[PDB]
Amino acid sequence: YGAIYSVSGPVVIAENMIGCAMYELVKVGHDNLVGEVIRIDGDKATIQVYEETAGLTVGDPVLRTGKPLSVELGPGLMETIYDGIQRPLKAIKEESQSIYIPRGIDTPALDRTIKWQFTPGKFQVGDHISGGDIYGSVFENSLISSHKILLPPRSRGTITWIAPAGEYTLDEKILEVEFDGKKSDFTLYHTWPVRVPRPVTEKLSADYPLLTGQRVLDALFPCVQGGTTCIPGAFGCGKTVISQSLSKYSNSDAIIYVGCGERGNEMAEVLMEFPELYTEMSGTKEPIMKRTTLVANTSNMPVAAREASIYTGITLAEYFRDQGKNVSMIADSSSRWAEALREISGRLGEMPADQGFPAYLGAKLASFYERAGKAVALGSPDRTGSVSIVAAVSPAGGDFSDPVTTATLGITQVFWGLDKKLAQRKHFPSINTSVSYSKYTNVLNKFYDSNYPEFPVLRDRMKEILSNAEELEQVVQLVGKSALSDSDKITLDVATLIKEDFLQQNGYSTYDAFCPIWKTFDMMRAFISYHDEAQKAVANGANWSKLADSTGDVKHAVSSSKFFEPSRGEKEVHGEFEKLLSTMQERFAESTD
Template sequence: MDTSKLPKIRDEERESEFGYVHGVSGPVVTATAMAGAAMYELVRVGHSELVGEIIRLEGDMATIQVYEETSGVSVGDPVLRTGKPLSVELGPGIMGSIFDGIQRPLKDINDLTQSIYIPRGVNIGALNRDLKWEFTPGQSLRTGSHITGGDIYGTVFENSLIKHKLMLPPRSRGTVTYVAPPGNYDVNDVVLELEFEGLKEKFTMIQVWPVRQIRPVTEKLPANHPLLTGQRVLDALFPCVQGGTTAIPGAFGCGKTVISQSLSKYSNSDVIIYVGCGERGNEMSEVLRDFPELTMEVDGKVESIMKRTALVANTSNMPVAAREASIYTGITLSEYFRDMGYNVSMMADSTSRWAEALREISGRLAEMPADSGYPAYLGARLASFYERAGRVKCLGNPEREGSVSIVGAVSPPGGDFSDPVTSATLGIVQVFWGLDKKLAQRKHFPSVNWLISYSKYTRALDEYYDKHFPEFVPLRTKAKEILQEEEDLAEIVQLVGKVRLSSCEEGLWVDILPRLMVGMCMHALGTYCCPPCQLNNRHLSLRPTKSHWRLLNYSRMTSCSRMAILRMTGSALSTKRWASFPTQLRSMTWRDMQWRPRLRVTTRSPGP
């Protein structure tokens, strides 16, 4: 492959002073003659100009973690200082794109090189410079207007789902001296010009932001709206909020990636940022294959889910140092769309691979290891990442609110939740969806263990449920009581079998629990369950009386409610079959039993 045509770092970015490679140890490079460099400064290493970041300074010696393969780098090679931190480009064109860990567009690299691999030292802009966007300036914006950081000065329709709001960078302010008229512009065209204290500054549709720096907000707000996943066990028993933090730990094969992808497909978020951090390449291939085919209905129109999704792919065969960059790239993109007033969900799969990269680099730096060889600052790094989530009041005018929800998958070795990464994560996040290997082996998906999982947002959401679904909280409490009873009955059944159960306990074990917990997630109707239908399913599970069946109108039922019938009858019902169903129910023998105060449960009597 001829790499001579690949664009290199621009001449105007070069500096007169270079450092020189002193030593190479895997992704860690030491350089001399680096006096004046700054921590986390972006550098270019070697003649191939590999992307790196300074992570330690000692005198004129700098330690650099390189985000590309360091094969061929030798002592004495030049190290170019750029004088800038590792940053991402923010602007129109992010949605529907797939980037690597340092925001290089993989599709553009493939079109340029005709190779399935990323060549070393390639330097391509994250956003397409040739694509034209229809720019519309703000209605109240005119020459002489005063604007400050965070103010929205124009809009661009990125696609039919995302209205991209162009915001003034947080540290900028001034008086408008020029605003571009409505029309088509590329991202490099000047659309706004400000003057402040006699200095003029021009702005394009692109703004650059350091990935390690948190974007400022006016105020952090308490969460008040649930993050709906469509999975009954998660939304009903262990809910998360928009702006919350969630961990999904589980062993190999428990379904962490399936839950993350399900959240990306069906959650009630406006924007999805999916980060594949050190996971297998076939999982990202599955995302790329499935997502373009998935659709959602918005205002009566069917739209592709990819229109609201951006992917950051850093597979396990890529350099380990880039795993950390992919996490920070994803959260910075999320904060950018949050500042527009959108509710953003970021999926990180998996943070354990990031922790393993920290352990490898820490070992090469000869740092004192902590538990299981992880660095002592592991918890601080995880906390600095998860604390960037939240619901906020955005900077600038007009007033708007946005949120970033973080869902991080954790892969403890052997499913051991005492793993340092899992322990550190659980001390930070507010929702814990623990996956059980035994449930997964029984084909019980999602394999969420309801005995160890928890959510600290239940009380925060009580007001929301009381307002919209008054019966939701009492039914959830009853469901949890039943599940706790199941744990006690399970020990009895394992020891002596079902024959020792009373009729009340047998009704609970045989009839209620399968209805309550077992879903059919692989069925077309079972992939998503909305809150009203979850409430209806709880009624069907806890109080399946004849009168309740008669009140249901099949023609008005949603797909979720039909799914509940499918779970209970074993087959889908047509409108004609549904009309005769109450008659069949009346012919059955039903017996009531009181097994808990104010909870009336019925079970079908055995046949002759």
Template sequence: MADRTLQGGIKKVSGPVVVAYNMSGAAMYELVRVGTGQLIGEIIRLEGDTATIQCYEETSGLEVGHPVLRTKAPLSVELGPGMLGNIFDGIQRPLEKIAEVCGDCFIPRGVNVPALDRTKKWPFKPANIKVGDPITGGDIYATIKENRLIEHRVMLPPGNHGRVTKIAAPGEYTILDTVIEIEFQGEKKSFNMLQNWPVRQPRPVAKKMMANYPLLTGQRVLDALFPSVLGGTCAIPGAFGCGKTVISQALSKYSNSDGIIYVGCGERGNEMAEVLMDFPALTMTLEDGSEESIMQRTTLVANTSNMPVAAREASIYTGITLAEYFRDQGYNFSMMADSTSRWAEALREISGRLAEMPADSGYPAYLGARLASFYERAGKVTCLGSPAREGSITIVGAVSPPGGDFSDPVTAATLGIVQVFWGLDKKLAQRKHFPSVNWSISHSKYINALETFYDTNEPDFVSVRTKARFILQEEENLNEIVQLVGKDALADKEKIILEAARIIKDDFLQQNSFTPYDKFCPFYKSAWMLRNMTHFYDLSTAAVEKTAHVEGAKITLNVIKQRLGKLVYELSAQKFLDPAEGEEAVKAKLAALNENLTSSFVALEDEFR
């Protein structure tokens, strides 16, 4: 650091952007320390011997001529045991540790605290690997019981290979203790449990695979109508107050991912505080029946709206790099980015400071390319190294278009990239219909990929879902007629469509996140609920059609409601069944309702014959 050849000076300061001279030999995206306070910055443009730097900390007080020190390394994150349950800022500084060291609620400028604890000892257990064995990048050579939810698999960093000359005995080691030594062509290298990885560089994989297992979120409208896969890309656009953050947090709490990286990128600080309060209190039940805090499988990257703009961009890359590390261990991780709009606004501000040519709404012309390079780091992969394993990253990006306008450049660019679109509707939110996912504009391109899963678990589910989508679509078309001539002018068949749609909308698509029975809905319960609702529609329509051309008494919707009112209520009350009763008990009750519907309609038809 003290080498004068690696030192430049400040030429100009403009907000978070600093221009430095005497920087010949510097590389793009190299990490630098700016000013006497040694603020962290990253080179984003090189011209001659001047470098343009984006600073990740407040630049007030910098002066022309202050030193700029090069580090000869890109912006990197530390990967190793101790990441889970931790909370970092956008450039992976541990916020709790900084609070302890500084004793202040604000982060001082230029603070330099290592991301992972250097003193904590971890229980190291070597895999069945011995001296003389060949080893290559990505091979798992040991495991660490990080907590009861996740076993940390220690891998050789990518790009290294050779024969093992020494491996540590089982015991307790810190992340800086040498645990393995390898030799290749006479050259020896030793490794500890800590890896450094540049955030802008995707970690290598053996090959990308087709994802075919659903991301089960516990939200009925998402699992049934617009499913995603483990390794998918999802976008949740919506105006303020539509429930983006609640859906993101529900995914973090209840989804079937092995772990979560939650990036709060430019949203309100209170939202991250809410996550910090809620998550430690939430528990998940293990196979042995014991409860563990969900925080043990979660890493938070908090980069709120009152933190420096430039660090928002870094926080997205930091989050995805942490997720890639766990994916390489063979886990299915999800990354929540809340919200990518704030990241795009940070790009816009930096682009404006650099006097680049603006595109639509002032965003830079490369906005779509940056979004795509982020989203394409998702996916299901075959990991490098042995033993053979598969891992995945699912990215769920919340988008906050101003005023809920989906033609906003960020929303439009995101829509062209992601495979699942969960559009939130302000009108539904105002009616207190949550989750406020609009079933008319939302879509999923993973439906065909999941057919094998449905055939195995719920064989008739695809036809049931198609029927439900048809009912909702028909109801939308009928609503225009109802507004003109009223409900009474409709035929009974059309009235049944409206009634079936009402049941589906109010009792299936709507879900109360704050109740024990409805905060999480397992897939088997969603499938049975929808099956019974569409079964009611089929039976009602058939009964009305059978007596439509008969003289005398006819079966109408009013007759069905009067005679079978209890069954209609039971259809609505399906959601009150608590999954805690057990899968078999819930399935038995829902199957009994299905049989009850069939027998009741047969009896009703016999009566009117």
């Protein structure tokens, strides 16, 4: 075994090691603290021990597990709250008589007290099998199987025996696979290392919408399933609000929520909040939560957990992605993950890169966003799946030019900016067209056009109204509004309405917070019809003040529209929006003449 040579900080050095990878999992002492071997210097391997320490004797045994840090992929992880080092928090509440994990402790990663229902597959006796094949399924949800159990990758052979339908335990073996003698027996759960991305047959171009549920996101620059998103903070971001939205509204089969070393209050809000809210298609077994599995970490909880959080979460996502399930993976917040690398780089003593943030931040980050995307499922059956990675980031430099933000901006596909002034007025989440993009919009808009919406034309008209508004707004502040004409006076006004009404999605309703793809379309259409009619009316002889005065009541009605539920008319396409079109047209005749 090992002998502990030095304990200096969270970095611990032990002599008389052997084996040792570079991601090998070790348990330090009899306390059994979480660590990982970072380096080797001589016979002595340098391990950062990321668990808290106030009472670790130097000269105790260090035990190798013999293998890299991994997560267990199998049934019963759903509807379960874990940390990134994989210990059931729920179990930790019972045992420990403490909600968070106490140091000096370690316990198994999956409850081994429950039995699960195995139903046969599509692989009977003598069918050939190769990893990601659906061997059977275990029901976990009351409408779907959330866990379809696969043979682990890099396993193959022909199945001598499939155990029959029935209830079994997850410790219990139910399969024998033949490759080169008796290969092994298999259980319901299998391991996979988190530092190895799970294979895939082939990747597919993204083409199927992520319904974000939010107007301001659909309207300004839409995202796609298979997407990548970067959001910059400054603590006016409203990350929990939009994350909570993403969990409920996104139509993904599974959602993996990842707490990357957070407040500990916010992760607690989203756990409690899911059973109170309802699913988007009926079902109760703690509704939203039944499709949601949580990684929850707190800021001064073990750093291994925090670091492992995005990797463990994304591996969870990849498993469901090979099962052929669509997954929305919400990483909140990766800049605290990047911070951990700053810390690591400091403790070791190695020199950093730009502003003390290491150079290995860009490459590691780039691998991560690349493991997400839309794909064709691993194995013989062939299914389609998705991983949509949505990641919040923050400065710590008081600018947007800092390494963390910059390295994500390089790589990211969709960017939703943050404008501090709007957020100061409150407009969660807050964006302008000049600070945000989606490269995906073009291909998305053709898809939306098929669906019903007038979506393409509305995307070009939306950008254009905001872009003109920005230029004119400088001229108004400094010079005066005296130079401007009445049509451009209108440009500011229609644009203001869009700021208050779209961006603001904090609400006190779930109608002021959920805006369906159809609800988002009607609103945008109604507002552009106004602007076009408005520029004409002043053009053939009418004033900005006079026009404003005549619509008057009808303008209030479009502002307040957002509060109204979407479940009426045809579906979310209300008669309330359709009648409004006629009243604009009528108003146009009055305004002009």
